[PDB]
Amino acid sequence: MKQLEDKVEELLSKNYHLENEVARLKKLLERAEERAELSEGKSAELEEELKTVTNNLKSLEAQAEKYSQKEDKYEEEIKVLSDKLKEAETRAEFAERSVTKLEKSIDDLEDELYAQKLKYKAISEEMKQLEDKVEELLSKNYHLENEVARLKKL
Amino acid sequence: MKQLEDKVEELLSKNYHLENEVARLKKLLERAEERAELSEGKSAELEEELKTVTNNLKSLEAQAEKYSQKEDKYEEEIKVLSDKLKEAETRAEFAERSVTKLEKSIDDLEDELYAQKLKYKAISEEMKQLEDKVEELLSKNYHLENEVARLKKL
């Protein structure tokens, strides 16, 4: 029995050991659980961050869609203004050259009209001298006729 | 002793449940450690995803910035072209209206020259009739003067 009494002394110790092992396993278990909890929590916050960023992205993609379009609009707008500008500068350039030419034409017509008028004035003056001559002769003949009659009565 | 018997029996039963608890906890620990690993792996994968989507968003923002300034560029070009077009159109219109004015003046000058030539023709015609009248009266005058001379010497 002195051997059996020593057995009880062992089971007590070996049980003391099992107890310590149980406590150790429980501490490690809790550490694993807390690790998993911290990570699952981080994933959740990251999940949220991914949706937020992804949304913001699908928006810039869309904005970029409107940006590219306006670009082609502006391009078409500029094109039209350029072609209008060219056409107007051409109309201007040519019309101005026409003005100079037309003014010279007017100078020539005026020179011609002036000369024509000078000619008219001169023939008019000639007419007046001829009229004065007719008047002068009608008078001379009226009196010569009376003189011819007077002489016949002498 | 019967007493020791019972003591041993108690410790063995206790020892039994303890061995089973250690075996059970090792199993739960194995599973909790696997869970943590898996969760930590997911977090790392999500973190890398967020970094990538973030780098893309930042890239789209840079682009969006170039569009905004290049947009103000196109805007500036249009205003520049617009002001020039207004200036060109005004000068074009001015020169073209001048041309219309000068053409109308040329037409009026042609009308006057035509009318002036008809006047010259009309006066030249009277002139012809006047010269004929003078020739006739000079004739009559000539014969009358001769008749007076003749009568005076009888």
From Swiss-Prot, chains A, B:
The modification Phosphoserine is found at residues 39, 59, 105, 124. Its main location: cytoplasm. Transmembrane segments: none annotated. It comes from the Eukaryota. One of its GO terms (cellular component) is cytoplasm. Binds to actin filaments in muscle and non-muscle cells. Plays a central role, in association with the troponin complex, in the calcium dependent regulation of vertebrate striated muscle contraction. Smooth muscle contraction is regulated by interaction with caldesmon. In non-muscle cells is implicated in stabilizing cytoskeleton actin filaments. The molecule is in a coiled coil structure that is formed by 2 polypeptide chains. The sequence exhibits a prominent seven-residues periodicity. Belongs to the tropomyosin family. This is Tropomyosin alpha-1 chain. It comes from Oryctolagus cuniculus. The chain holds residues 176 to 273 of 284 of the full protein.
